[PDB]
Amino acid sequence: VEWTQQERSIIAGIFANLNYEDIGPKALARCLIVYPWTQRYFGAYGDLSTPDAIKGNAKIAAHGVKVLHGLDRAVKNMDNINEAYSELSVLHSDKLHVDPDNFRILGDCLTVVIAANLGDAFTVETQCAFQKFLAVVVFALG
Amino acid sequence: VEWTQQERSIIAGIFANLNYEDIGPKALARCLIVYPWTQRYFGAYGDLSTPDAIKGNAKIAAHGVKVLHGLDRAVKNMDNINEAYSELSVLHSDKLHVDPDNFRILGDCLTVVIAANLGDAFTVETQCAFQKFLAVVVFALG
Amino acid sequence: TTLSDKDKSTVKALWGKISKSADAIGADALGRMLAVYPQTKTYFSHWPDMSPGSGPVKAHGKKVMGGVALAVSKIDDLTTGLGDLSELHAFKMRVDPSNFKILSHCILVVVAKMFPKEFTPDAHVSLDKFLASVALALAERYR
Amino acid sequence: TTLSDKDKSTVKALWGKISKSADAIGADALGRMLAVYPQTKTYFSHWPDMSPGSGPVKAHGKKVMGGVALAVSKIDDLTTGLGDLSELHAFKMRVDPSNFKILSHCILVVVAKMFPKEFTPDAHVSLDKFLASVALALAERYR
Ligand code: HEM
Ligand code: HEM
Ligand code: HEM
Ligand code: HEM
């Protein structure tokens, strides 16, 4: 976008704090549980029948961690998420045709997980910059 | 991708045949009536109380035609619509902060009014082209 | 989302006037969904042809407007009314909700185009509400 | 959007643990919607001060969670139960329906922030359903 230094360092701050092994699985699982239509894209990832089974799923969990590494890559590229995401965009929009509303919805899920995890570190200012960030990511995906 | 010849000629053709004073007032008024929260932006325009009033509103009719000339500008500049639209972008997004889904809505009311107008001429392929054009203007406006 | 008395008569009268062209509305609106909004092809990719007027679109367009008719008769309870098809779309097929608005739009366009004089702003508002209540009914079995 | 017996039970169980923080939740949620989604501020433009934790944000936040408290009371028919709140937001104020999802989202974030242990995926699906129902029921008086 047109980042201030404070936003850059808040955003890098959030992803320096997060353990992606914990956050990733939680956020993706939660996406699949709260918005089950997104299960459609994960037919190859084995067992998605109940919630308890979603959380127990190692393939879903690892994929949640890859989504965070994806995000982290966008934090390495804050001024060119578009370019940095081109192949991810070909993949989500040209190949899989995920409706843009879905990127929004997993973004939201992720913000809910990050909020639960960070507690008092999740200030208003922190969320403002985090959302600005996700809004660039979803535009880059679509 | 971007514009096929057949596409630019369909779009040029819609706008050459178009009877603005007919399509513009109709679409805008339809939008205010079908999606009444859009009325919020039109307090200066007087009587918006009934659909009968919206339909008979002279200010609303003039503005509907102004909308259509705003599209003509994208029509004349099909390759540079983002630039052509930057001031209208700032007006719509950075000043009025119209949620980007309303643009989609009005572009929907407009497709319906054009479909009712054109009848047999609003072929499948004409709709593909018009919606691809509209997607480009709404993105331009956001 | 809930329909007024005014809403339900409007849709009935309008459906009164346009039922006789049901198979063709379905087929044109479906045919238009798939060409104008090609992201929607994913759910229909097992068909040998998705092109406008092809046999599959005509055949299915017929069923979709079948379902529309049901809703019209079911208009006081779309939830129970459309239980089974919601089960099919929302649970079994997992059709993304963003898609129900696309087909709804395509149906109002074809209807405007076919019945420009009956497709009044008053009709539009009620038809649109109705197609939204159908969308919501269909979304019941997602979660 | 119909809420199951499980959804209502989940929401009421969650509300039983959280409700003594209702004022703090409303405040923190309104505050964030206005700062994180500054476009919602056009509705609050006559207010002196819209900033996180300010006097007006706190006073209004209480009201807003009083409205959620009200919906938990009316969960079997939000459509009627929030009729007056619809009148105000949809008919008088003409709040764009896209902003309800924003405030809903902000409330879930603050509940998750405040009660991370209570806010499981299971609480999350049902609270998100409930919030959508709240959001639909508030949209009743547009049209
Ligand atoms: C916040 C938005 C999202 C981000 C940042 C994101 C990120 C990613 C990343 C990093 C990958 C792996 C790319 C690679 O290493 O080659 C991926 C793949 C994938 N994403 Fe997403 N994603 C997002 C939203 C979504 C949504 C909404 C869906 C649909 C519900 C989805 C479905 C998939 C699937 C099915 C794959 C991999 C399929 C395969 O090749 O096995 N993603 N995403
Ligand atoms: C298809 C998408 C749209 C197009 C092409 C469009 C086009 C235009 C144009 C050409 C103008 C005249 C600008 C000028 O004089 O500098 C304008 C002004 C305006 N538009 Fe739009 N518009 C669109 C969507 C919307 C929507 C959805 C709303 C409201 C919800 C809206 C509300 C307004 C308002 C309030 C004005 C200002 C008129 C005044 O100052 O009295 N527009 N728009
Ligand atoms: C108003 C909305 C809709 C209505 C009333 C409707 C109605 C119906 C009906 C009556 C059937 C046939 C079920 C049977 O075989 O007994 C059907 C099937 C189906 N619908 Fe829909 N439908 C709607 C929307 C959608 C949307 C938005 C999509 C995805 C873009 C979609 C994808 C399908 C598919 C893939 C089938 C089955 C096709 C097959 O059997 O090969 N539908 N629908
Ligand atoms: C969960 C959804 C919502 C609930 C439960 C809610 C609840 C309430 C309540 C209880 C009131 C005060 C009514 C009274 O005076 O008796 C109120 C007022 C208001 N709400 Fe909301 N609201 C919601 C969403 C929204 C959204 C999305 C907006 C705009 C973005 C909004 C803007 C307003 C405004 C401007 C007022 C009146 C301001 C004033 O009295 O000075 N609300 N809301």
Side-chain angles (χ1 to χ4, degrees):
Chain A
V1 125
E2 19 224 282
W3 299 110
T4 70
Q5 188 51 244
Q6 190 61 41
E7 295 161 336
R8 288 169 196 266
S9 58
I10 277 166
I11 283 147
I14 295 173
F15 290 81
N17 182 97
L18 300 178
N19 192 155
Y20 311 164
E21 249 14 76
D22 168 42
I23 304 304
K26 293 208 226 267
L28 217 218
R30 201 169 275 258
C31 182
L32 296 181
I33 284 159
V34 179
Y35 307 105
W37 65 93
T38 51
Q39 281 166 225
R40 214 201 153 228
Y41 296 96
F42 295 90
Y45 289 62
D47 201 20
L48 326 167
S49 61
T50 69
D52 266 7
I54 289 197
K55 353 227 225 174
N57 198 132
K59 314 89 237 160
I60 288 298
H63 191 72
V65 341
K66 325 211 164 108
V67 170
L68 270 286
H69 285 306
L71 290 173
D72 179 277
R73 201 236 232 248
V75 187
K76 297 335 191 271
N77 289 100
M78 252 166 96
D79 286 311
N80 310 85
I81 292 153
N82 276 341
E83 294 95 353
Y85 268 35
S86 49
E87 286 121 66
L88 246 28
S89 188
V90 174
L91 157 63
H92 297 79
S93 305
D94 301 327
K95 180 188 143 163
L96 259 26
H97 328 253
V98 171
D99 200 274
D101 221 51
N102 296 301
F103 303 137
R104 212 222 347 144
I105 248 93
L106 162 77
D108 285 340
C109 270
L110 178 49
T111 297
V112 171
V113 175
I114 281 170
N117 181 269
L118 280 187
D120 294 332
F122 207 60
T123 72
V124 172
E125 199 183 353
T126 298
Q127 187 180 176
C128 286
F130 191 61
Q131 174 56 203
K132 215 141 163 162
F133 174 75
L134 292 175
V136 181
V137 334
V138 309
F139 178 103
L141 301 170
Chain B
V1 204
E2 225 58 91
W3 301 117
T4 71
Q5 210 73 249
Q6 178 85 126
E7 273 163 4
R8 326 166 153 268
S9 297
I10 302 211
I11 279 137
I14 297 160
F15 280 83
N17 182 104
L18 252 226
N19 170 183
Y20 292 31
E21 56 123 57
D22 198 337
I23 300 300
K26 264 167 211 86
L28 203 219
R30 206 157 271 254
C31 172
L32 300 196
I33 280 169
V34 175
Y35 308 102
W37 70 89
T38 54
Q39 308 176 194
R40 183 170 190 270
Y41 303 92
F42 296 100
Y45 284 59
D47 196 359
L48 295 179
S49 84
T50 56
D52 289 323
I54 291 174
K55 287 208 265 178
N57 196 106
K59 241 153 212 289
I60 279 304
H63 198 50
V65 345
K66 212 190 257 59
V67 175
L68 262 324
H69 286 125
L71 296 173
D72 209 38
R73 187 192 279 115
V75 170
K76 302 325 203 271
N77 287 107
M78 273 177 74
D79 306 290
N80 326 51
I81 285 155
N82 290 140
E83 298 50 40
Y85 262 65
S86 48
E87 239 152 352
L88 232 23
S89 185
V90 167
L91 171 70
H92 269 76
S93 263
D94 308 320
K95 174 190 171 165
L96 271 351
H97 347 249
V98 175
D99 190 276
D101 224 69
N102 300 296
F103 296 143
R104 169 191 76 70
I105 286 337
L106 176 54
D108 301 343
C109 296
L110 170 52
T111 290
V112 339
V113 169
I114 284 177
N117 183 248
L118 299 182
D120 300 319
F122 192 66
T123 63
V124 172
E125 119 183 87
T126 302
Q127 189 187 175
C128 291
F130 190 64
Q131 177 63 199
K132 168 166 332 210
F133 172 76
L134 274 186
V136 167
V137 326
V138 320
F139 172 94
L141 282 164
Chain C
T1 224
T2 76
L3 302 169
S4 66
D5 287 325
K6 194 253 237 300
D7 293 314
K8 334 180 208 195
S9 25
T10 301
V11 174
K12 239 102 152 212
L14 190 73
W15 185 245
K17 289 140 200 183
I18 83 164
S19 32
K20 181 214 340 92
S21 270
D23 313 340
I25 294 161
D28 197 6
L30 229 205
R32 271 153 192 283
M33 188 167 75
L34 303 155
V36 172
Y37 303 94
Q39 58 260 230
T40 59
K41 321 228 247 218
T42 64
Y43 301 103
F44 298 98
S45 60
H46 57 299
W47 295 2
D49 194 341
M50 330 175 78
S51 82
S54 64
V57 0
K58 277 203 297 196
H60 210 74
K62 186 182 277 192
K63 285 193 220 147
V64 172
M65 295 315 295
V68 177
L70 185 61
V72 180
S73 43
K74 304 292 201 172
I75 203 145
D76 349 50
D77 193 333
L78 292 167
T79 311
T80 333
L82 315 174
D84 326 68
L85 287 180
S86 175
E87 194 65 28
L88 193 86
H89 291 85
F91 185 93
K92 185 171 281 99
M93 296 194 302
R94 246 66 261 222
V95 174
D96 183 324
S98 82
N99 294 295
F100 295 142
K101 341 186 282 262
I102 296 171
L103 179 64
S104 287
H105 174 66
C106 294
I107 294 181
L108 307 178
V109 164
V110 166
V111 164
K113 173 203 192 270
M114 297 178 165
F115 305 85
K117 55 312 229 188
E118 300 75 355
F119 204 67
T120 210
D122 200 62
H124 191 165
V125 168
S126 304
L127 199 68
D128 187 64
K129 286 191 52 189
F130 163 75
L131 292 172
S133 295
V134 166
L136 188 87
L138 248 15
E140 288 288 328
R141 309 282 241 241
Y142 278 129
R143 59 180 199 154
Chain D
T1 53
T2 286
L3 306 166
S4 69
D5 283 334
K6 174 183 254 206
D7 294 320
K8 296 184 228 189
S9 151
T10 303
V11 168
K12 277 172 193 157
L14 180 70
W15 191 251
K17 313 158 160 211
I18 260 84
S19 87
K20 282 140 249 317
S21 304
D23 290 5
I25 300 174
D28 194 2
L30 219 190
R32 281 165 183 270
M33 156 184 95
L34 306 164
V36 183
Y37 301 86
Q39 78 269 197
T40 57
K41 295 203 231 220
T42 173
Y43 305 94
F44 300 83
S45 64
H46 66 294
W47 286 8
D49 187 0
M50 290 173 30
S51 69
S54 63
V57 171
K58 293 185 165 200
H60 201 70
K62 197 172 270 128
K63 296 203 183 118
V64 162
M65 291 312 283
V68 173
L70 184 65
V72 169
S73 295
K74 301 313 179 171
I75 204 171
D76 297 329
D77 186 354
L78 288 163
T79 154
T80 332
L82 307 167
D84 190 55
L85 282 179
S86 185
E87 189 67 15
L88 176 71
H89 284 85
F91 181 97
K92 293 181 188 185
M93 281 198 297
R94 267 34 205 284
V95 175
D96 179 312
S98 62
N99 297 302
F100 301 125
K101 318 184 265 262
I102 299 177
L103 182 56
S104 290
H105 172 63
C106 289
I107 288 167
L108 298 193
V109 169
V110 167
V111 172
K113 187 179 176 282
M114 293 177 78
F115 298 91
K117 358 62 152 245
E118 292 94 354
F119 193 61
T120 52
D122 213 72
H124 188 174
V125 218
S126 287
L127 195 62
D128 177 68
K129 285 181 74 190
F130 168 80
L131 290 181
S133 287
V134 168
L136 193 66
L138 254 9
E140 203 80 44
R141 320 269 251 237
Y142 283 125
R143 47 198 203 158

